[PDB]
Amino acid sequence: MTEYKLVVVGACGVGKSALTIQLIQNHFVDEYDPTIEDSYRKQVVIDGETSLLDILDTAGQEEYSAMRDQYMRTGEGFLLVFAINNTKSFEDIHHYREQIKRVKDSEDVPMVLVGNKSDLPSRTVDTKQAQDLARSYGIPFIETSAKTRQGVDDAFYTLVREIRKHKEK
Ligand SMILES: *CCC(=O)N1CCN(c2ncnc3c(F)c(-c4c(O)cccc4F)c(Cl)cc23)CC1
Ligand SMILES: Nc1nc2c(ncn2[C@@H]2O[C@H](COP(=O)(O)OP(=O)(O)O)[C@@H](O)[C@H]2O)c(=O)[nH]1
Ligand SMILES: [Ca+2]
Numbered sequence: 001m002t003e004y005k006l007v008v009v010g011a012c013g014v015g016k017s018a019l020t021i022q023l024i025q026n027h028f029v030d031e032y033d034p035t036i037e038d039s040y041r042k043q044v045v046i047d048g049e050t051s052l053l054d055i056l057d058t059a060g061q062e063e064y065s066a067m068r069d070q071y072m073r074t075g076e077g078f079l080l081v082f083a084i085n086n087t088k089s090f091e092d093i094h095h096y097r098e099q100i101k102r103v104k105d106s107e108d109v110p111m112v113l114v115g116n117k118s119d120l121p122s123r124t125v126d127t128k129q130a131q132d133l134a135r136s137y138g139i140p141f142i143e144t145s146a147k148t149r150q151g152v153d154d155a156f157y158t159l160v161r162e163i164r165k166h167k168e169k
């Protein structure tokens with residue numbers, strides 16, 4: 001009854017593919033081709049309404065392309081993924097947000113900030129610092145583990161709720 005294009009972004013190694021493959025195939029990948037980009041589909045009921053999700057798992061290279069702009073423009077909501085043990089990945093979030101804003105030609109784009117790898121003890125990004133970032137962006141923040149599945153469905157489903165909220169703006 002409604003289709004949603006979701007796009008998963010963030011630095012290399014943060015767990016984009018792991019999170020996506022957990023959601024879709026219900027297993028954790030220890031190693032997955034670091035540059036392949038593909039889309040996945042899945043149907044989910046969220047708040048009583050059937051959602052047909054088309055999920056783009058981004059990767060590729062550190063480069064601009066008009067082709068990438070074109071697929072990114074199709075996205076209706078974005079997961080901004082960092083790893084909680086990788087401060088550089090957190091620092092990179094700003095860039096991803098900016099580039100989304102660019103291609104969507106909009107400051108108000110449905111997004112969720114995702115702190116992945118929450119199962120690891122060696123955290124270098126505080127929950128508070130993320131929460132404050134997400135506050136400044138006006139978006140939710142969810143901590144996930146693709147390894148244990150903690151928060152995986154929540155991250156994706158919260159993004160759909162964000163998209164729904166926006167489509168009524
Ligand atoms: C390990 C491979 C990997 O996961 N990645 C490769 C580097 N990526 C990446 N690097 C820099 N900038 C990126 C970027 F700006 C976008 C982006 C564009 O170009 C337009 C609109 C919205 C965007 F997020 C993307 Cl998709 C990837 C970028 C990805 C991570
Ligand atoms: N411990 C832990 N490792 C993870 C988690 N998510 C991803 N990884 C690992 O981190 C590495 C990169 O994951 P991947 O999904 O390929 O990252 P991507 O480059 O963002 O697509 C892999 O070794 C994964 O097994 C997580 O939640 N916990
Ligand atoms: Ca990947």
Ligand SMILES: [Ca+2]
Pocket residue numbers: 105
């Ligand atoms: Ca404009």
Ligand SMILES: [Ca+2]
Pocket residue numbers: none
């Ligand atoms: Ca601005």
Ligand SMILES: [Ca+2]
Pocket residue numbers: 137138139
């Ligand atoms: Ca908002």
